[PDB]
Design a binder for this molecule. Structure first.
Ligand SMILES: [K+]
Ligand SMILES: [K+]
Ligand SMILES: [K+]
Ligand SMILES: [Mg+2]
Lengths: 265, 276, 265, 276
């Protein structure tokens, strides 16, 4: 949806990219300090005068507290920039190990959603179904799923607006979620999609959110995934194909396979 | 006098009553003062103690604070440049004590910094006022909240609680909480703006109530908001409370979605009422 | 209850005591390493021979990576104990900052329980009550309380055993818990203590657990407290005294005050 | 063949399929190998690279691994003893790169070590077998669990789930979960031993079921346990699964509280049945 109007770029991207961004910050800080050492004369013993190289590889050994010995500071000016850079490379370490420990605990759910939903007959009634799989060895316990219809309806005083329905499922918790789960909304008289058709959904501008949480044994943290389906992505009459080949195996290759009947025109 | 402040904090003086919470919830610039600050005064206290035991620093100029201080720094920080060095068993004691102080120091810092980095504000703006006005032909208590960020808040939960003085048969006067039922209390994706609605049916504890009856019971309304911030991959909490004098009877919130399809949060607190 | 039968002392005590325990571990490790430096001859340049002092204050400067310069190692023996002690004082730092960060997130609830319960008439019915207070400025949100009766009853085939009841409360959640909360179990016909008396509780060996949780704004963590009452600690006819003096104040001095009527013998 | 292993892990081969999880859940001695190990091979790789650019270490003996290696150590660890020093702009590059490697190294270590220190096992022992036998005159499916630690587990929750093959009218054969109701599913203080009981009333999905009927549906029972460990001030999870052949029909668990008032967990898995 398009926006309107009314430092904080605390962002986490690729692992390679993160390691460079942090390499980068370590250099430019070392350079800013080198500059400043030169910018009070030449206050580094054993340092070649009017050199960046020497005052930089001094900062490095001061921020990293290597303190190697040869390159030391000279009386009260550079001994002030040495106490400021001691702090910077101890806060620097703390922010780095923050971001690191943070990133190590912002974990992906590794939950695969079926490419489509189906409406087809299960225990006597037309039933809206979709399925999700765990892409990992490590189990997800206390896993809950919500299947929410959102669509356009009208009120008494017009103001024609957007309503949410939490579709009753045959089962909304998987006590351990390990392999695959087929989430089923039976379409009985109570259902907000009773009597509805491909066309009647399309008109109401009907979408289905599948919202998924569980506790991940992998991360010892709670984990979240969602997916949205349009009327376009429901195969009326479709049956998901068994993904459990027999000896007991689970083929995620069959995960998005749906069997429909085609009619003898 | 408000029993609850706007911000849902309690407005009641406590009696019969180290810190921590202040370092976490203080400004980023002010924090960076207090650690730089602690860092100087510990280097000072250690410089003093070195001088308190004579000329126990190699290549120091004697009875000097600057020399011993900028020695402390290089020991605490484990720089140990190797010119300004300690002397025999008097100083070398303080140098082991100080090495600890600047490894525990580092540990406390990373703790605070991580804590701070993972205690994030909800993006959440509450309407300044509530309204009672027809919705589906019934009087309906409403307020609205908005997400001030691009990043959605997932699996978002809202509670609207009446708190009011009530008298028993036994004539005990006590405060009672009520969780007003809402036409919708959940938002799967909360991205823009959400109007929360308590239909005042027969079951509602404010059925047949008026601006005057609410005022008598000292009625207050606490809004509680939670959800999951995909910004921070953490759960967020926001609360807000309203007094009687913050209900516009007959108010209607003005549409906040202007046109090329836009959310004007300038209009967010705007309420239209009819006048006579 | 008395026990029967069938390294891991990961314990957290006083703040002073914790700081010494960690001081202590830093010394004895430094001493164990000093010993070992002496235990391969005298392999420390500029170090007074057959001295503990010198080889200890060398370990310190090697484990702490001060590396001061004067005291260095001598060829392949002590250069092996220098790489082992580099690791020890980087794992040492990690365990220390672990324990520290851990302890900074094992926070006390600061929930005060009333010294006694009362049974007295509230909205028409005898009502078992007790109260709890927050001892802190920082609010507790999403606070839940359980009040559980445990007592001795008999089954059909004897095996006379110990049953739990979760007493219905007038309100078991405090949406924000800031000041004080009076938790009330109305004793109606459904109640497991309907018709019961001081004596009938005593016989059944009846105890009441009050179990309390909420999310602490202070710690951004979940927080837990419990308390158990015996039949002995119920004041039949007692009314808690108002702790809100009027201008609005909360006196926790009145917290444990209970008003009973005494009878004109 | 078990669909679920005893330990509640899934016993099914996966196809259509860096690490992390291995460092957290491996032995304490083996972990301390792998970090010492990583530490040596990185010092080696850095020693090699120093020698790959000639005699760029002061006071080193030339074409030497030990000298450059024990230089690496003193740089990575930021000891920098100040004798074994680097030479001009070739090495001094590798010395800045290496200073990083041993600050990120430290950060990864503290991460793992904290993670490990706060991922604690539940103290929990499950009975090896379940039993069906009269309790309050009804057949009753039972198992029991015990706390192997002194420290109570608070606000403890137990789920007992039947999982079995079922056929629809449409003749689709599928696996169905059922949450069997228990006489008690909560334990406020869980300190000793707890017998969990599914009365097999008319409502139970195993009403009128027999060892033979359960076997046909390939019935399995998953027990799920959670609570709050006052040991670790964290929540703990434990699961266990049983097959049909692990139900003793007519079994009764033997009392585990011997006498001076004692819990003999030797008796924990003991079941008494009548014989003919
Ligand atoms: K040095
Ligand atoms: K150093
Ligand atoms: K040196
Ligand atoms: Mg150092």
């Amino acid at each position: 949806i398009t926006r309107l109007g009314l430092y904080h770029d605390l962002l986490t991207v690729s692992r390679p990219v993160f390691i460079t961004l942090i390499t980068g910050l370590y250099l430019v800080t070392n350079a800013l300090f080198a500059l400043a050492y030169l910018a009070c004369g030449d206050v580094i013993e054993n340092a070649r005068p009017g050199s960046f190289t020497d005052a930089f590889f001094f900062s490095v050994q001061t921020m990293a507290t290597i303190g190697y010995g040869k390159l030391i500071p000279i009386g009260p000016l550079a001994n002030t920039l040495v106490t400021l850079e001691a702090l910077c490379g101890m806060l620097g370490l703390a922010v780095a190990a923050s971001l690191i420990y943070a990133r190590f605990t912002r974990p992906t759910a590794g939950v695969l959603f079926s490419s489509r939903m189906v409406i087809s007959d299960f225990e006597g009634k037309p039933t809206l179904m979709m399925r999700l799989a765990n892409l990992r060895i490590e189990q997800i316990i206390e896993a809950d799923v919500h299947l929410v219809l959102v669509r356009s309806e009208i009120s008494q005083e017009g103001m024609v607006f957007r309503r949410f329905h939490d579709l009753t499922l045959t089962r909304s918790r998987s006590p351990i979620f390990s392999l695959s789960w087929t989430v089923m909304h039976p379409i009985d008289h109570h259902s907000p999609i009773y009597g509805e058709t491909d066309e009647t959904l399309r008109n109401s501008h009907s979408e289905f959110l599948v919202l998924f949480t569980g506790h991940h044994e992998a991360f010892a943290q709670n984990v979240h995934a969602r997916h949205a389906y349009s009327c376009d992505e429901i195969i009326w009459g479709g049956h998901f194909v068994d993904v459990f080949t027999t000896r007991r195996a689970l083929d995620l290759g069959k995960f998005h396979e749906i069997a429909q009947h085609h009619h003898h025109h």
